[PDB]
Symmetry: C2
Subunit: 174 residues, 2 copies
């Protein structure tokens, strides 16, 4: 059986707009979203509707009281953690070896993931290459870049990869 | 010499927030940003500051009166165009063959790129795989996913791919 599934873990996100955009990405690729309290914003439809393009309503989402709660429920799992100080790009890990849940962990836009977690998981920390250390990407865009690298190595699972003949002879004619 | 450069082309973007986020991505990877009028918003520091995290100030950006203006200045270049109806994923084109400007073209969040452009460039149209056609990603997130696929095939050019020994023995100790 296929047991391959993208799991996105957000460690104490601050910004409603970022969580909303991530929800929209998670719906698009059928990922599971794990959110670890506390949050910097009010978690409801009012604050997540616009940034999620209404995908708040359909996202597969689990909330946890704190890190300990999440770890308690996920014993002996590998976490791939995004850091400024991550050893190498995510494209350098071999995900074709894995037929299981993969967990991509993203921290607060301000200061990333707690140092004790990175230390614990230093061997599976990844970075997104940029021109320098004064540079940054929006956290929502990083969830997309990291997710689609794992998805490429899985041949995009059951996502729709190719245009039908309906599409092509529509554009190359009508 | 290296002539490899990411060029992002935005065809009549509607939303200031999207252009701002793209500017931030362009600065992070040293891409050139080509913007084609008309725009759905006021193009100034006031509307682009927050969404760009102030990267508006440093982005390498060129503006064009319309499509004809852009094409006039870019005769016989290949355009890789994002479409819902794109033939295959961007990871299926071989960019390792190219030592030149690559042009990734993105249309308005509402209705994508003008049909006559897609028809003209149907052979180099790409899609971002998703679970179905009712699904969508934010345009800014698509610029990141597409850019970093080309960058992976170029071994990330001169972006910073690896942590120094300063970083590692900082975390694995201090």
């Amino acid at each position: 059986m296929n047991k391959r599934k993208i799991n996105i873990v957000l460690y104490q996100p601050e910004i409603a707009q970022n969580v909303g955009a991530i929800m929209r990405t998670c719906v698009a690729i059928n990922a599971r979203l794990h959110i670890i309290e506390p949050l910097g914003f009010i978690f409801d439809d009012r604050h997540l509707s616009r940034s999620s393009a209404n995908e708040y309503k359909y996202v597969d989402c689990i909330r946890y009281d704190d890190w300990n709660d999440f770890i308690t429920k996920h014993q002996n799992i590998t976490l791939f953690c995004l850091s400024r100080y991550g050893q190498k790009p995510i494209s350098d890990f071999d995900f074709s070896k894995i037929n299981d849940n993969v967990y991509l962990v993203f921290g607060k836009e301000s200061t990333g993931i707690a140092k004790p977690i990175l230390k614990e998981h230093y061997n599976t920390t990844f970075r997104i290459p940029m021109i320098s250390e004064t540079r940054s990407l929006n956290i929502a865009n990083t969830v997309g870049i990291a997710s689609y690298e794992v998805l490429r190595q899985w041949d995009y699972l059951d996502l729709v990869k190719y245009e039908t003949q309906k599409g092509k002879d529509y554009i190359l004619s009508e």
